[PDB]
Design a protein around this nucleic acid. Sequence first.
DNA 1: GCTCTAGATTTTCATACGGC
DNA 2: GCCGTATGCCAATCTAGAGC
Length: 591
Amino acid sequence: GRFQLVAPYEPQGDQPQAIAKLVDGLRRGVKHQTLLGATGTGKTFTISNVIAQVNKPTLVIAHNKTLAGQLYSELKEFFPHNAVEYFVSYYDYYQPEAYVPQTDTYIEKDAKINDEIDKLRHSATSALFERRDVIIVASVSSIYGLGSPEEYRELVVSLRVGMEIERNALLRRLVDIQYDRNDIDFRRGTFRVRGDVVEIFPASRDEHSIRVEFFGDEIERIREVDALTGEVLGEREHVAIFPASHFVCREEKMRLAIQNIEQELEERLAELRAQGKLLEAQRLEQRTRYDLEMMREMGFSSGIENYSRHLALRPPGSTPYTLLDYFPDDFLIIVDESHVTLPQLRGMYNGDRARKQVLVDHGFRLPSALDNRPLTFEEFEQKINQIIYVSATPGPYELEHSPGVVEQIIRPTGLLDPTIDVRPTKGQIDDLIGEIRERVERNERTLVTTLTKKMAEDLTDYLKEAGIKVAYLHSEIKTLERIEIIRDLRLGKYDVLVGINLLREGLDIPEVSLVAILDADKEGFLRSERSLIQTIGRAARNANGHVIMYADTITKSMEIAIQETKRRRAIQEEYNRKHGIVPRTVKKEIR
DNA sequence: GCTCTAGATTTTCATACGGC
DNA sequence: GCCGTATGCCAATCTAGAGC
Ligand SMILES: [Cl-]
Ligand SMILES: [Mg+2]
Ligand SMILES: [Mg+2]
Ligand SMILES: [Mg+2]
């Protein structure tokens, strides 16, 4: 395939040079590069240009699913002729199996699956074999266990007009790859028959079923079919039907796997019983033998993922197969918000290991359950072909592995990194209150950041006493109601929002002209250099953007952020001067 | 170095049950 | 043994500080 970028506009401002640097580094074979793109500079359009120029299948990794969704929307509009795909957790809810020693409690695994997300997951994986012009937006789900891509590929049922194959032989192979017959409710992951037509709804597709028409053992035709109404659509010459699960469990391997699980259990029970952990072994035997009977009286068992490694016959310690393995060897990775996303990726292994080791220590699971896991960060490193880290505040790992940075600060809209004032703590709430009132005069909103949920709630109350319209925003408030609070800020219900750590990455509020950082000098994660610069960027979407940092000293963290903001402004002033640009505030749609 | 602390996101091969 | 349906808010992750 071949990527076709589609937009009205050309690259502008800093975008051209940025695109050129990243493309040349990629072509020279450089492994790690870093796009130091300041906020609201059109970072998704820049990276799309790179993808379009180098024409490699690409994985965009995001640290959260809201941002994941936006990237996926924007990229769908930029590449409407290409396979833009989505790959995140497909669980409506999920609690893992866990044991909590401090409160001596076992917690059952509970789950519930979202059908749309599973459909997208299958569209994503199948796309990577059907064609080369694929971009997948993904969460850290990308580093979790799937079945091997080789097995996933060889189980495909490939069909072409002219083929000779027994009607029932197709059907019986479809069942092998996890499809169900269903003449009543014809939906994805199911098939049916209507005389000569064998109608197949692939696992990757919402509304568009295949219709394979037979004459004896021949295939006279194949047809994509709109299943909203029932009408027929275009007539293909071939089609590929991929498995309706990323996990194969065939009996041929399962028989030996059972005796391997059987013999790991013996050894572990002897181990536990020897150490006077008699309760633990009784636990381990009761679950393992029950699961093993289910494994003999059925294909499945409960918690089957715990026996991943045995059921695959792969050795102890094995690195799992993942989405990354489904990509070609010359693929490309974009890491969105790398300073937050990479630490998250690092820690997926740690938390999973922690949780599973206590299950194993208390005899809920065998030691081989540790091999059912995500990648370690080191295993992620070894699977990188080439990678681009995007962030306004790139972290240590990105800088240390990249040959300097591609800097992109000039915004196509000419908006400046705001000015910053530093004021004393003496009489700070009154100074702020008056400064908010001037903003309410100009119909401009304000963000205030404190250190705690308690302080954010107390200031909201106190600002209500002063007659200011205001809400607090922190993580006690569920996602749905946060969307609504932010919506209601823009419409004008509130002139102020008080927060802690939800007022940085991916918050475009054009109406905000003031950002108030309280306790600006209290050293810690909330007032580190990066979180400081990220908070400052909330005021860079409005032409009268301003920052007040209340503090009595100026920390090292404060002085780097002040200096790097000033420098960025000065460069943006000069570009604006050269081109006669007067900064204009962002007109963005509500909802 | 170990053990707290604050406010943050993400992830994880559904399953027990009653009525057939 | 098969199948349709009601069901949960239950962990350990991160950074970068503070006491020892
Ligand atoms: Cl979506
Ligand atoms: Mg499934
Ligand atoms: Mg491997
Ligand atoms: Mg590679």
